[PDB]
Amino acid sequence: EEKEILWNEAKAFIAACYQELGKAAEVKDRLADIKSEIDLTGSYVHTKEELEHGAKMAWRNSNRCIGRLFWNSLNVIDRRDVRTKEEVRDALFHHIETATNNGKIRPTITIFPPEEKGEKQVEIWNHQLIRYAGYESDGERIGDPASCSLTAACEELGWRGERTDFDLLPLIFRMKGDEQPVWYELPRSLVIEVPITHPDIEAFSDLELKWYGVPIISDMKLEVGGIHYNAAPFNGWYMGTEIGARNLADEKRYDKLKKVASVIGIAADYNTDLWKDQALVELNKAVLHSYKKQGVSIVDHHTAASQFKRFEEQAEEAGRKLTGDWTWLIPPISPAATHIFHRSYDNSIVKPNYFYQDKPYE
């Protein structure tokens, strides 16, 4: 059952991949080499060209992603050569540095050795390479509640957080063979953070809010033609709403709306005053303004939706079927102001793609 599946998926992938690359005639021979490799070894090794394009296709097929217009410019880093935890760590450090690019963020993926027999070579525990810790002890709520379980896991391994609201979690991953993961503190010089100020409300800085520059999702599995790259951290730049409308706004996250209303000088007493809505807008304006002032890449939800419209148009032109998840594609503020809201999307799964995996903690 195992080698069969790998062969079928590989057939579908190589055909489509080589077609797109204008390498249609090189298929049969490449498919031949692959079949012999599967027979003998139980798996196959992607060329750099297949891997790079497979990672790009996977982003293109990510139904929940509004930023897919730039799928073909993804910066792919091939690190299937790593064997040591020092190599993994430095690769992760490197990813952060080059993706950050002094603020002009490069969408980047670093690809580690794939699963062998379903056995993981490298297992990254971080949800994102850069993420704030979260604590709850005796009524006291500190940091990012979404990070509570991973934080406790890290502290079970000898890490200790300073217990600010913005403790940088350590990188934490487990190598094949080891019973426990290792953790490495993040060098502050690698991590860009953005203090949140408002363009015309001076008191906004009293909230002492900040967020990190680059969202680098590191717990999802990249699947390319039957090969499972369980460890392949990827990043884009933020859409402002992810920070202003969710990370800082959600009651189960930083829950800052009541404090925002206070500093912008409005009452938070009546639903009919729409104070949460007003606070959301000013906070989201602050986030966009702050990243722009510091020279860190970010996109507003209107511009992002426009770009996505072009992705839809580009897809139709290329003869490609379009897939998407309406419930994730709409922005969390003023979604009806975008074209996305006013149409429907086929939520079918197409491979290559990125998939959820079970957390090793929890």
Could you tell me which residues are annotated as the binding site for heme? 65
Query: Contact between 143 and ligand 2AQ (CB under 6 A)?
Result: no
Burial category of 185 from C-beta neighbours within 10 Å (exposed 0-12, middle 13-18, buried 19 and up): exposed
CB of 297 to ligand HEM, least distance (A): 8
User: In this chain, which of 18, 59, 135, 291 binds ligand HEM, going by CB under 6 A?
Assistant: 59
Contact 311, 334 (CB under 8 A): no
Q: Minimum distance from CB of 220 to ligand HEM (Å)? A: 6
The neighbouring-strand residues paired with 128 are 217
Task: Select the residue interacting with ligand 2AQ from 190, 217, 266, 350 (CB under 6 A).
Answer: 217
String marking each residue 219-258 x if it binds ligand HEM according to CB under 6 A: ---------------x-xx-x--x----------------
215 binds, among a second copy, ligand 2AQ, ligand HEM, none (CB under 5 to 8 A by kind): ligand 2AQ
* Termini Cα distance of the chain: 30
Q: Of Cl ion, ligand HEM, ligand 2AQ, none, which one does residue 328 interact with (CB within 5 to 8 Å by kind)? A: ligand HEM
Write down the least CB distance from residue 327 to ligand 2AQ, Å.
14
Residue from the set 82, 129, 239, 329 that interacts with ligand 2AQ by CB under 6 A: 239
Stretch of residues binding ligand 2AQ (CB under 6 A), selected from 43-51, 157-165, 191-199, 233-241:
233-241
Angle at CA 356, nearest 5°, toward 116 and 19?
70
Q: Tell me which residues in 75-134 interact with ligand HEM (CB under 6 A).
A: 107, 109
Nearer to ligand HEM, 224 or 257 (CB): 224
Can you spell out the DSSP letters for 24-72? GGGHHHHHHHHHHHHHHHSS----HHHHHHHHHHHHHT-TT-TTGGGGG
Q: What are phi and psi of 71, to 5 degrees?
A: -55, -35
Contact 51, 13 (CB under 8 A): no
Q: For 25, what's the count of Cα atoms within 13 Å in the CB-facing half-sphere? A: 0
Query: Where would I find the H helices in 157-300?
Result: 240-241, 257-263, 275-294
Q: Could you list the active site residues?
A: 65, 68, 237, 242
Using rule CB under 6 A, residue 238 touches ligand 2AQ? yes
Count the site residues for ligand HEM by CB under 6 A. Answer: 19
Q: Which is nearer to ligand HEM, 142 or 245 (CB)?
A: 245
Closest residue to Cl ion, judged by C-beta, is: 215
| Cβ count near 291 (within 10 Å) | 24
Tell me the two tokens of residue 21: 């690359």
User: What backbone phi and psi angles, to 5 degrees, belong to 93?
Assistant: -60, -45
358: buried, middle or exposed (CB in 10 Å: 19+, 13-18, 0-12)?
exposed
Name the minimum Å distance from CB 264 to a second copy. 12
Residue 354 makes contact with ligand HEM by CB under 6 A: yes
Locate 155 and state its tokens.
Answer: 């502290």
Which x/- pattern over 14-53 shows residues binding ligand 2AQ (rule: CB under 6 A)?
A: ----------------------------------------
User: Site residues (CB under 5 A) for Cl ion?
Assistant: 215
